[PDB]
């Protein structure tokens, strides 16, 4: 299963 | 901009014999950017019903990808692999050797 | 033995007109088992392994939503990354992100990875302790920054100790019939005559799983690396790799050289003799 949130860089 | 020129094999699914079924298959690797042109040919012939593996990488970030279709070895026929990429001045062409 | 559960993900702009493409892949170890590409009729997560397709329509909504959020953020980044690097807006550039997790053979929790390129060179990762960043360059001190303020690494371990973890195992065990089985290199050799005194042995390992693997030559018993070749190990197509490893030597000698197979689908390293 996918990570539920990417942060921007 | 570092461009990586992709490594190439071209080679058979299952040892070969003539008049058997099999797949053609065209490993490219190493290569960066990921935009790519490749084809299998039968006699320079591009073949139609050609795939390919969903495009991913290696730890040092260079992409590989599998293109193949199903073929029929035989004695006279020439098969082959076509290759574009930005770091090569025009295609490069790899004859499929059965031994190899 | 471990097994490893990753994301790879490729944004690359398309700075003439429209949005970045972009292609995400899951793996097993060395099974592909989802994908998600941009360019795509669906725009869906897809399964790629039958054991995946055991997971009912949430899954798939879920998946789908997570990795459309994924390319926002790809797509974002190639922006401000273009700024930081004072490139134009005319060329194509591109991000790549793997992120993961092992289970050791406990089944648990083991390792974790997140790693970011830029262009084809690393940008900034996670430490094995998953508790600080590596920046390659000034550009990624940026990032850094704001990841540390933002505890970034917090969320991230707390996913990988935890949900990547608790999923793999659930695969593995949904998956057992083909993800957990070790399928030995079917091992043969050719011989080639390239002159009237001299012949080519290549020494062949197929349909084996997973890729890892050790192919080499001895001559009476030692190793030999002088006058060899050897390719590597490639996707045969149906799941598992092949590998060879070739040696030319004197014709009539041939008795004295040995290939040896290492593989974790062995018991005992195999050696073979041309008889």
């Not at chain 3, 793996?27 to 998600?36: A, E, G, L, P």
């Not at chain 3, 926002?72 to 005319?90: F, I, K, M, P, W």
Request: include cysteine; hydrophobic fraction near 30%; charged fraction near 25%.
């Amino acid at each position: 299963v996918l990570r539920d949130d990417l942060l921007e860089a | 901009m570092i461009q990586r020129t992709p490594k190439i094999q071209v080679y058979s699914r299952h040892p070969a014999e003539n008049g058997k079924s099999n797949f053609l298959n065209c490993y490219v690797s190493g290569f960066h950017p990921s935009d790519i042109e490749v084809d299998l040919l039968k006699n320079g012939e591009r073949i139609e019903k050609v795939e390919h593996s969903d495009l991913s990488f290696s730890k040092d970030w260079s992409f590989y990808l599998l293109y193949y279709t199903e073929f029929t070895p035989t004695e006279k026929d020439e098969y082959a692999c076509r290759v574009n990429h930005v770091t090569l001045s025009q295609p490069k062409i790899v004859k499929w050797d059965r031994d190899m | 033995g471990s097994h490893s559960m990753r994301y790879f993900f490729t944004s690359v702009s398309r700075p003439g007109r429209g949005e970045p493409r972009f292609i995400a892949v899951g793996y097993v170890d060395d099974t592909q088992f989802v994908r998600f590409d941009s360019d795509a009729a669906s725009q869906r997560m897809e399964p790629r392994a039958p054991w995946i397709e055991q997971e009912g329509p949430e899954y798939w909504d879920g998946e789908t939503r997570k990795v459309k959020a994924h390319s926002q953020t790809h797509r974002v980044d190639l922006g401000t990354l273009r700024g930081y690097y004072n490139q134009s807006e005319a060329g194509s550039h591109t991000v790549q992100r793997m992120y993961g997790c092992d289970v050791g053979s406990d089944w648990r929790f083991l390792r974790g990875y997140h790693q970011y390129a830029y262009d084809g060179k690393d940008y900034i990762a996670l430490k094995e302790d998953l508790r600080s960043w590596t920046a390659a360059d000034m550009a990624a001190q940026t990032t850094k920054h704001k990841w540390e303020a933002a505890h970034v690494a917090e969320q991230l371990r707390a996913y990988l100790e935890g949900t990547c973890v608790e999923w793999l195992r659930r695969y593995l065990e949904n998956g057992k019939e083909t993800l957990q089985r070790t399928d030995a290199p079917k091992t043969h050799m050719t011989h080639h005559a390239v002159s009237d005194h001299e012949a080519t042995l290549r020494c062949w390992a197929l349909s084996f799983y997973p890729a890892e693997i050790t192919l080499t030559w001895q001559r009476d018993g030692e190793d030999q690396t002088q006058d060899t070749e050897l390719v590597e190990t490639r996707p045969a197509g149906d799941g598992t790799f092949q590998k060879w490893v070739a040696v030319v030597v004197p014709s009539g000698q041939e008795q004295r050289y040995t290939c040896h197979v290492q593989h974790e689908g062995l018991p005992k390293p195999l050696t073979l003799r041309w008889e």
